[PDB]
Amino acid sequence: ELRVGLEESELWLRFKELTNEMIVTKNGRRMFPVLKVNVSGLDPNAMYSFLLDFVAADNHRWKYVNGEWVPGGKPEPQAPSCVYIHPDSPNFGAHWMKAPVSFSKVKLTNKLNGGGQIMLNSLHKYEPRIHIVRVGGPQRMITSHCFPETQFIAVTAYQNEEITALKIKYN
Numbered sequence: 073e074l075r076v077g078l079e080e081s082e083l084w085l086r087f088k089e090l091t092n093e094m095i096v097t098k099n100g101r102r103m104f105p106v107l108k109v110n111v112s113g114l115d116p117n118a119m120y121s122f123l124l125d126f127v128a129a130d131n132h133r134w135k136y137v138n139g140e141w142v143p144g145g146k147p148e149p150q151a152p153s154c155v156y157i158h159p160d161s162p163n164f165g166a167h168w169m170k171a172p173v174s175f176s177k178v179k180l181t182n183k184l185n186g187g188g189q190i191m192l193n194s195l196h197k198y199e200p201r202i203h204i205v206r207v208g209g210p211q212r213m214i215t216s217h218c219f220p221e222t223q224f225i226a227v228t229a230y231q232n233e234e235i236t237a238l239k240i241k242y243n
């Protein structure tokens with residue numbers, strides 16, 4: 073059975089209990105913490121690509137009012153985010169299972185851009201999600217996994233200084 077787990081869930085949970093924030097910039101900003109995933113139960117000889125996308129967790133714009141994040145009253149449909157391909161892709165099951173799969177090079181932007189960078193909606197809340205795609209084989213297969221512990225609001229600057237302090241303490 074294919075098992076997907078979050079590495080350093082302890083740390084992620086401390087961010088989550090404060091309401092996590094990730095910076096987005098025109099050129100794109102790397103994530104901290106980095107999403108790192110433990111995977112077991114792949115066919116070590118089979119070929120797979122690791123994909124990352126961001127689900128809009130709700131349909132609302134958020135705003136930091138009197139030191140607390142509060143959702144707007146005017147929800148709108150959220151266009152799904154683009155997919156980031158893990159740069160080790162495609163790769164053997166053995167490669168993916170030998171160490172945590174680390175998305176250290178994904179960049180989050182607020183502007184439609186050349187390539188690599190993933191555009192997100194400013195002040196919307198996101199739940200990171202991966203897709204494990206079996207490739208090259210005759211029978212294509214996809215397993216998806218969400219990481220609620222890794223939820224965050226996309227911001228152009230940090231609102232809650234508790235988040236800023238944790239980002240610095242652990243980086």
Ligand SMILES: COc1ccc2sc(N)nc2c1
Nearest residue numbers: 149150151152153191192193
């Ligand atoms: C996934 O990134 C985006 C960026 C801007 C907008 S406005 C809208 N309706 N949804 C989105 C999603």
